[PDB]
């Protein structure tokens, strides 16, 4: 019906097959309607966007070089630099922030983080899958000058007339960073919202999009601001704990699969819950950072829900100042309304 | 034992009695401790004034001169200024703000404040002796210029040598207002608190005060700032709602009955609750209020009660702005801490 998730698997080329089925999702809770996916060139995707609305665009040519990307071509090109990878004892990956984790002296981290040139990744990589399993590996590296000089020029062949005109029409600010991510199949990045706005290159392997609007904060309960886990959902997705967390019984997605050359639109605040297909092989991404729009002269009523999103953080943040400790927040949070606004 | 409430009624001189007895106090679930009553010369009674802890002095003359006073003598001398009078249909004076009143279209007043002249105050309690019952009404109203001459004689005699010498000691702001209060036996001003500090020099009658401290905040459950009864316990202490207001199980207060040449200190941010003696007759007091000293260069830890009541208060009041809407400032608290630190 009115929701159909990633909708059917769409069909390859030369009668290749489906590129994937329904058997390679995870299996979750909640419903989710489809994200469209629209040429770059339909007024529809400009107004999307420009709504601060998902949509995939399947024809920018945005990543068009990167296309041939692999491991080996990587490892041969991409050079000699250190790379950040994490590893996970389960599919899902708990990032966290490092400045954070003495707010928390309790907090013991399930995700680390090493450094390795690209070949150790590839060697590591191939280490498991004969070993095999099962341990993960997500490789999540900004894209610098340390890249050879082919890399370099694939880089300079993406389609920048085409962002670089998104940019200016939403008038956002400068590009932050371009994120390179490479995973194994099955890895889960679980539902965060970033405060930037994102393009989502897919390059290589499928990846199951699932994202939530601003207003289903409180369907999904992020940690403290102060908690290294800051912006990301407390709520297990594959076992979901109602009685801390009822609303999660109410939240609603909207999904897409993602493919080689397609481009997702991820707007700053929305949630989103990002997995590489299962069995779908190896997975990889090109993300492009940029911050948002200055907020605008004079406020407007009634605010956006990522306005209030923004209120919330800041009087966290702030009492977190005032009181000079982190974890007295809650407490005073807590005096503040018991038998006053409950 | 260490909980003695006002403690024993004081011997009259003369062998005139006691001038009052415990029959003449309303009940409560609470437990009190007394208030210290001291020599204004003694050493403990300066180090709880510093400390901004309650002490009734009982030797200050603050008010010497006003000691003459009652009705006939204020009637004849006062003048022909409007006074504010405050009438209600039950024993409890429900003080509200007038100016926040649109925030709550839905707040209905208990209390009604109309303006008379000082003749016509006497002469609507009159009324209501012989009437009789059961209106009450409570006159309060600021000190100014318009009092007729043998008051200002009056006013200029207080001990002002005593109380400037304490307003510089303590490095208070400056006498922001002297009210003038006159009720009728049983009346009762119900719990709240106050930012200034405050010097309440009894005249005529007796009232018990029961003060409770900044850190029983959360035994007490201020009305929201926003509300018309902003700085108020919402707990109705004739019949506690212990559902609502489970904490209040926890208060404990500290209580004094205070006679005419009493002076309480009522720190700045204390709870106190004051009532006018049953069978007492009529009761006069003058308020002495102060700005309290400027909040310290650097601040230091931790933080004291009033302190972090300061701070609820700003959010909650920058929360009522930055939404726009007074009425969106619970809904938004909760969604912050529901699931998140609670
Ligand atoms: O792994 C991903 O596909 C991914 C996509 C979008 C994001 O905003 C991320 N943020 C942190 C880690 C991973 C991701
Ligand atoms: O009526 C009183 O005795 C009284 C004493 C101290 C206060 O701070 C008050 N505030 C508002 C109304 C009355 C009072
Ligand atoms: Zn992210
Ligand atoms: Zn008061």
Request: glycine share 8%; aromatic share 12%; hydrophobic share 35%.
């Amino acid at each position: 019906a009115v929701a159909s998730g990633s909708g059917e698997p769409r069909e390859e080329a030369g009668a290749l097959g489906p590129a994937w089925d329904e058997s390679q999702l995870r299996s979750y809770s909640f419903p989710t309607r489809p994200i469209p996916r629209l040429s770059q060139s339909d007024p529809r995707a400009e107004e999307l966007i420009e709504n601060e609305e998902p949509v995939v665009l399947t024809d920018t040519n945005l990543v068009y070089p990167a296309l041939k990307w692999d491991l080996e071509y990587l490892q041969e090109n991409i050079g000699n630099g250190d790379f950040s990878v994490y590893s996970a004892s389960t599919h899902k990956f708990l990032y966290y922030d490092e400045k954070k984790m003495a707010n928390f002296q309790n907090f013991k981290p399930r995700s680390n983080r090493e450094e390795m040139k690209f070949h150790e990744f590839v060697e590591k990589l191939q280490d498991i899958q004969q070993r095999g399993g099962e341990e993960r590996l997500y490789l999540q590296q900004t894209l610098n000058d340390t890249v050879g000089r082919k890399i370099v020029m694939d880089f300079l062949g993406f389609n920048w007339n085409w962002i670089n005109k998104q940019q200016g029409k939403r008038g956002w600010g400068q590009l932050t960073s371009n994120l390179l991510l490479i995973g194994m199949e099955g890895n889960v990045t679980p539902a965060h919202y970033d405060e930037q706005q994102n393009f989502f290159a897919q390059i290589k392997g499928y990846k199951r999009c699932i994202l939530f609007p601003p207003d289903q904060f409180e369907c999904l309960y992020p940690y403290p601001v102060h908690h290294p886990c800051d912006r990301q959902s407390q709520v297990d997705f594959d076992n979901p704990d109602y009685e801390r967390f009822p609303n999660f019984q109410n939240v609603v997605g909207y999904e897409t699969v993602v493919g080689p050359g397609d481009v997702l639109y991820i707007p700053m605040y929305w949630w989103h819950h990002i997995e590489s297909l299962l069995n779908g092989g190896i997975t990889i991404t090109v993300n492009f950072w940029y911050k948002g729009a200055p907020t605008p002269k004079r406020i407007e009523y009634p605010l956006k829900a990522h306005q209030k999103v923004a209120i919330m953080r800041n009087i966290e943040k702030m009492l977190g100042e005032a009181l000079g400790n982190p974890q007295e927040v809650g407490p005073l949070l807590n005096t503040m309304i018991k038998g006053r606004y409950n």
